Swiss-Prot record:
Its EC number is 2.3.1.97, 2.3.1.-. It comes from the Eukaryota. It is found in: Cytoplasm; Cytoplasm, Cytosol; Membrane. Changing Y66P: Abolished glycine- and lysine-myristoyltransferase activities. Tetradecanoyl-CoA binds at Q4, F5, W6, F133, L134, C135, V136, S142, R144, V145, A146. The gene is NMT1. The keyword Metal-binding does not apply. Heart, gut, kidney, liver and placenta. This is Glycylpeptide N-tetradecanoyltransferase 1. Keywords: Acyltransferase, Cytoplasm, Membrane, Phosphoprotein, Transferase. Belongs to the NMT family. Adds a myristoyl group to the N-terminal glycine residue of certain cellular and viral proteins. Also able to mediate N-terminal lysine myristoylation of proteins: catalyzes myristoylation of ARF6 on both 'Gly-2' and 'Lys-3'. Lysine myristoylation is required to maintain ARF6 on membranes during the GTPase cycle. Its main location: cytoplasm.
Amino acid sequence: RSYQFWDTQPVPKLGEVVNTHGPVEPDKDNIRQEPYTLPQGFTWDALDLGDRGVLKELYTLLNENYVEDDDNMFRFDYSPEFLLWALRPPGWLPQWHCGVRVVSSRKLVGFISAIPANIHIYDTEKKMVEINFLCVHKKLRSKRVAPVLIREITRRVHLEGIFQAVYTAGVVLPKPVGTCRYWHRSLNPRKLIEVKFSHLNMTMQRTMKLYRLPETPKTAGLRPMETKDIPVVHQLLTRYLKQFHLTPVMSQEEVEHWFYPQENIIDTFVVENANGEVTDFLSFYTLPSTIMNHPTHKSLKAAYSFYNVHTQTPLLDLMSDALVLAKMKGFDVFNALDLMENKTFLEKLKFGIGDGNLQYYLYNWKCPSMGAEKVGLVLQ
Ligand SMILES: CCCCCCCCCCCCCC(=O)SCCNC(=O)CCNC(=O)[C@@H](O)C(C)(C)COP(=O)(O)OP(=O)(O)OC[C@H]1O[C@@H](n2cnc3c(N)ncnc32)[C@H](O)[C@@H]1OP(=O)(O)O
């Protein structure tokens, strides 16, 4: 299996064991000043997501052309407000919101993005970027536009003195540093079976009983995160992540951004104990999917496990409360990867394994691969 594009890139070869730690190639001290050439009739445009019209254009591109399931039944439906959250974290740069437009019509037909992130990989902390929202319009697929987008964002990141990146994809490329699986926990099994997200030895009555949850969380002192909690959430997260081999390193400003609750985007609940001390937190983000070509049910409301930190509340209890909270908030399904300590609760809390993998990658960094349990990084 050859990779016309990926074989040219500073990434390790598939099927080869890495015993070392470090960059694949030495840092470039001169970088190409001019954008890479797009096919005729197409032009680069940096997207100002602070402009409502431009943000809506990106929303529409992704709504119509972004990630689908392996059965082409469900497509991610990131909201405009969610995209602002994901794409304008602390240190975001305008040149890193990289759009492709049709010259004549101005139609947005391609996108890729970088956001800055400090990443801890084994014993090294590196300033990197996280690459996300790579998207080529359906009508432009299989025309080698993706490699141009990747090279162009690489160039723009290089200009800023950054030479490593982290990214995830459902497809196998050279070369995963970790392989994860999505698991799903049914909250509204009736709807999930109706739209064929899930299927029914069990009746519908038994299935609804099986997945039924308490109407309120059980953990004493669970409450939404507030401004006063930003420092302790930062403290808790930073200490908790030390045990994994691939993690973000977040400033307090970044913790505020990624965790402070925003309705329909990000939920974070902290446990404040009988002493007034915050000892644990749970978080999940909101990402619905379009139910493709369906006459009645148009959208699937999904919550995604983000970072869950336990020091005094058992993780099992925290996650049980996360499910209850998601149910209360009207979610149809709660999704979680098998990374960090998630395998300790997935089967227990009646999660079912999903189709397809989520591969974790580094660009221009060689290191040994790790088990899912050692991956401590969750991306939007
Ligand atoms: C230091 C700074 C570094 C910064 C950069 C770090 C690297 C970042 C890397 C990007 C991280 C993205 C993270 C996310 O956003 S993952 C989300 C990706 N988006 C989607 O899946 C949405 C719907 N799908 C599409 O829009 C796709 O069909 C895309 C746009 C992905 C491919 O468009 P198209 O189907 O029209 O194909 P092509 O003819 O233009 O090009 C074919 C080449 O593209 C390689 N390909 C296909 N899919 C992916 C993929 N997901 N990551 C990397 N490479 C991918 C493929 O192996 C082949 O190369 P090779 O097999 O010949 O070698």
